[PDB]
Chains A and B, each alone.
Chain A
Amino acid sequence: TKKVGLTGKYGTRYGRAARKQLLKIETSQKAKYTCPFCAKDKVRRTACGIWTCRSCSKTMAGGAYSLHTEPANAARATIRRLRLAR
């Protein structure tokens, strides 16, 4: 138990860069996110892009390793401003 928290599965294999990158992505993939609809931290991933709330029971499209993504958060915000204008 120390630096390689979830990447201990790999063992002494695949090299440090891959394990460090995997530690960020795998932690995000295995994380629990807040349902936009039910506001409870029970959204988990079923497949890349498919995230399902285990309380709300709602499936939402999302980033492969995160419910929301940085490009997409920008897009919703631009769409609301542009929609308010038109």
Chain B
Amino acid sequence: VRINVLRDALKSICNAQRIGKKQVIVRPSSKVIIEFLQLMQKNGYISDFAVVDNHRSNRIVVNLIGRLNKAGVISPRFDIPANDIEKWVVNLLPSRLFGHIILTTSQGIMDHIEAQHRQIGGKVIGYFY
């Protein structure tokens, strides 16, 4: 069954980049996928993402500029202590300066670099580099 909506969306995003296409359509729209796309858009990995209203579960059309290498989801959402937001950085992404792990925190769903400054720790949603 479709347990992880994010994984299906992000694998489609990365498969479309690997062939190299300008628009991809994601079959299930989730407010968490919409937030994940937003963090990537702000950082500039992706462009405009459009949520078509199915009136059922909805769809998303994400415009791909071609700068994303690997975007993934860490499942189960694991619990990351603040004195471990750095341990995840080396195991998951390439170089401390390049790449972003998104972790949900009481403050919100934010990239690790922001959380490290706030001295907060959350639950990891996924890795986009």
Do chains A and B make direct contact within the complex (CB under 8 angstroms)?
no
Residues in B lying within 8 Å of A, measured CB to CB: none
Question: Which A residues have a C-beta under 8 Å from some C-beta of B?
Answer: none
